[PDB]
Every structure is written in C-alpha cells, then in structure tokens.
C-alpha cells in the first residue's frame, strides 16, 4: 500500500528489462524499508505501547524515553518510590522529558530480610507509533527508491569502493565507506528529517 512494485520498476529503469524477478524485489523492498526506519527513528505500526523501566538520569529530570511516544499523549510513571502513578505530556520529536522533583509520595518498606527492602524500580508505560494513517513524506520514499535502484544491479561482484577523508590509511588498503544506501544519494535524501 505504501509503494507498489510498479513505482520501483519505473524509477529504477527496470520496467522493460526486468534484471530481477518479483520475489527478490519484494525481498529488496523489505530491506529498503527496514533500513531507513532505524536510521532516522520510526516504525511501520501505530500504537506501539512499550512498557519499560525508565532510568532517571541525575535527579533534575533527565529521563530519556527509548521510543519517543506521541506528541501529546500522557506517559504514565510508577514504581521507584512512586506510591501513586502520575502522567506526563512528552516533547514532540524529542524524548528528553523532566521528572518533577516534587514527589507525590514515597511508599518505602523499611525492614525486611526477604527482599532487603531495596526498591521496585521506577517504570513507565507509553505508546509509540505516533504515525497512524501512515503519512510518511516522500523524502524517505525517494531515497528508498534510490536504495533499491542501487541494489538491483550490485550483487556483490564489483568492488565499487569510494574514498573517504583524505589521508590514506597506514595499512595501505583500498579505502573505506563502500556501503549501499550511503555511497548512493540515499543518505543525502532522508537527512532533512534527522535532527
């Protein structure tokens, strides 16, 4: 539904001469979509609720949510001396949120020789997949088309190594950075979204 094979075969100069069968084009396309999503940070399913122990960095509220939940949905916290849960509206685009230093309660359990009364750690539950209706811009789309266009004719036979920063490594190798979706335009395409 996102990208039909006809759009791939038309941009990638392979409608007339296939050069690839169909199932590998599916196989390449899955790889094309699961490379940009983790390069910028995204998913392909809505409401991906994640339960996760949140480790408050310092104490001034340097909590970092590992999935950047919805832009206005209240994330809930519990455990870690938090006797009563409390919600929090997160930042859109960023995950750096702040734990209010004002504690609502501290339900400690002084005295026990079965759990050494240490703590139940601070935990949080929130929803990922802020992308319902799936409205990803064409930016990732064109780069993904560039990724498949690079991979359709690159089985791994030619070397195709391009130079990086000037100084030649002391080992005397051929260089580095011979990478699909990198030595092509793909990186320059879906970079207007990475912060």
């Amino acid at each position: 539904t996102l990208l039909p094979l006809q759009t791939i075969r038309e941009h990638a100069k392979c409608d007339d001469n296939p050069r690839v069968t169909d199932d590998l084009l599916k196989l390449y396309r899955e790889a094309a979509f699961e490379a940009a999503e983790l390069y910028t940070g995204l998913s392909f399913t809505p409401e991906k609720t994640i339960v996760e122990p949140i480790r408050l960095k310092g104490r001034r509220g340097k909590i970092i949510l590992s999935a950047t939940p919805i832009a206005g949905r209240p994330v809930v916290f519990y455990g870690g001396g938090l006797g009563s849960p409390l919600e929090l509206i997160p930042r859109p685009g960023s995950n750096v949120l702040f734990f209010p230093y004002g504690s609502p309660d501290r339900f400690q359990t002084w005295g026990d020789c079965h759990t050494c009364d240490v703590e139940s750690q601070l935990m949080a539950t929130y929803v990922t997949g802020r992308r319902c209706e799936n409205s990803v811009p064409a930016g990732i789309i064109i780069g993904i088309l560039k990724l498949i266009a690079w991979n359709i004719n690159n089985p791994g036979d030619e070397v195709m190594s391009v130079r990086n920063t000037l100084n030649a490594n002391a080992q005397g190798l051929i260089g580095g950075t011979n990478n699909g979706a990198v030595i092509s335009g793909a990186q320059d395409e879906w970079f207007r979204y990475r912060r």
């Binding site: 609502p104 309660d105 501290r106 339900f107 400690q108 359990t109 026990d112 079965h114 009364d117």
Partner: protein
C-alpha cells in the same frame, strides 16, 4: 512534606527454643507524602482628598 508511617510490622514469632535462627516478619510503611499551602489576597482603592 512529612512522614506518615503506616503500621509497624509483626517481628517476633515465639519460636521453639531449639532452632538456631529466627523467622522473618512483615515490614512497615512510611508513606512520605506532601501537602501544599494556598494564598489569600485582595485590593481596595481610595481617593486622596475624599480621604483627608
């Protein structure tokens, strides 16, 4: 904020006088909770001649 210790645990058990050990007991809770304070204010005006 202030302390709110809930209930002392049950520590001793009247064990038999042969075992070389006690038996664990229930813990107690302290409930470190808080409370805020409100404010009260208002205004009132006057003239200057009409007050002299």
């Amino acid at each position: 904020t202030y302390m709110k210790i809930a209930d002392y645990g049950q520590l001793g058990e009247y064990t038999c006088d042969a075992k070389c050990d006690a038996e664990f007991g229930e813990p107690g809770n302290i409930r470190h909770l808080e409370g805020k304070t409100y404010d009260y204010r208002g205004v009132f005006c006057f003239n200057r001649k009409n007050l002299q």
